[PDB]
């Protein structure tokens, strides 16, 4: 935002949500790799 | 399919349209000859006779009881222009003797327009300061422009914006009033004003930017702002005064600095 | 325009391409 504290809180929320998103995508990609690998 | 000999219906229609189109071209030329004609000699100013295919003069019934126009009766410009030919030939350009912006030569030239303001359909002055308009306001999400700094062609800050003039008929900004450092208030056409800090792409761009919000006028320099033609009556601008101001600003793209009149090379 | 001649291009199209 404007002050460092608001920016740090926004970064904390963004990083947490991004980590959750990446974890879900990683689980999905791992399941797909177990099902049908795309690197023979 | 033939009418007689090798003549047919399609050929007859084509020839009829060809003749009609020749007649239409002649008529369009006649209509195009209503302003600025007859022609005159480049040096002596001797007026040419006139077309054999010309008809009657055109009369425009003006609104607001202003009478008739008759564009064929518009007074011809004075043959003596404030300039001297670069070389003695019919095609040579004129070099202005003094200040082209003050004298009205080339891009700074103006026409002798009517000395009364344009009016709305009900008779009110068309171009007025936004306070005198009928409940006309700037768009809330658009720049307010009031108090913004004004940049000149030489990158100097000539002054600030003190008023906004709008067209009461077309609902458009026509002039910005600029108060200079000396305190003089001058009118500047909105068509020579670049508004900065209000880019659509920048708004789309997900950035936090403190871009300077100002108005740039690159037509004329900061000093030249002190010679903008003035208004005879406050809050009212005539067609002649509009032409004067617009010509003064438009001629700056050639005459504000000497380099603007020089080739790139 | 290329650095070849029209005759050379035509000969190449005929012999090297359309004839073999």
């Amino acid at each position: 935002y404007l002050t460092p504290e608001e920016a740090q809180e926004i970064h904390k929320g963004f990083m947490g949500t991004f980590v959750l998103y990446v974890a879900i995508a990683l689980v999905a990609h791992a399941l797909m790799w177990a099902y049908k690998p795309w690197f023979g | 399919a033939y009418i007689v000999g090798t003549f047919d219906v399609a050929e007859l229609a084509f020839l009829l349209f060809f003749g009609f189109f020749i007649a239409l071209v002649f008529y369009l030329n006649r209509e195009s000859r209503r302003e600025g004609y007859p022609l005159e000699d480049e040096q002596t100013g001797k007026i040419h006779p006139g077309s054999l295919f010309d008809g009657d003069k055109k009369a425009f019934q003006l609104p607001h009881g202003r009478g008739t126009y008759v564009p064929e009766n518009v007074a011809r410009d004075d043959i003596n222009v404030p300039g001297v030919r670069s070389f003695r030939s019919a095609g040579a350009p004129w070099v202005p003797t003094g200040d082209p912006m003050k004298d009205g030569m080339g891009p700074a030239a103006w026409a002798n327009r009517s000395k009364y303001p344009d009016l709305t359909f009900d008779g009110r002055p068309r171009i007025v300061p936004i306070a005198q308009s009928h409940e006309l306001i700037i768009a809330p999400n658009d720049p307010q422009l009031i108090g913004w700094p004004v940049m000149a062609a030489d990158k100097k800050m000539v002054g600030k914006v003190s008023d906004i003039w709008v067209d009461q008929a077309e609902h458009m900004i026509r002039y910005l009033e600029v108060e200079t450092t000396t305190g003089k208030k001058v009118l500047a056409p909105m068509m020579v004003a670049s508004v900065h800090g209000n880019s659509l792409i920048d708004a789309l761009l997900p950035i936090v930017e403190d871009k300077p919000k100002f108005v740039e006028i690159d037509a004329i320099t900061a000093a030249q702002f002190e010679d903008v033609p003035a208004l005879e009556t406050p809050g009212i601008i005539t067609r002649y005064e509009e032409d004067r101001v617009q010509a003064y600003f438009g001629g700056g793209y050639m005459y504000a600095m000497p380099e603007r009149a020089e080739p790139w090379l | 325009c290329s650095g070849n001649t029209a005759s050379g291009n035509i000969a190449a199209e005929q012999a090297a391409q359309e004839a073999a």
Binding site: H11, F14, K36 | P206 | -
Partner: protein
């Protein structure tokens, strides 16, 4: 690292990022649907 938010507005950045992510995800899913190998709907 947090200072990134002193330059980019969070609301507009999130909106643009989510629009781009939606476009990319739909593109990838349709590309996978196109292929015979990764089509998950036509056959059993």
């Amino acid at each position: 690292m947090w200072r990134i938010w002193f330059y980019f507005d969070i609301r507009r950045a999130l909106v643009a990022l989510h629009v781009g992510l939606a476009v990319l995800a739909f593109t990838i899913h349709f590309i996978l649907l196109s292929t015979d190998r990764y089509n998950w709907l036509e056959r059993a």
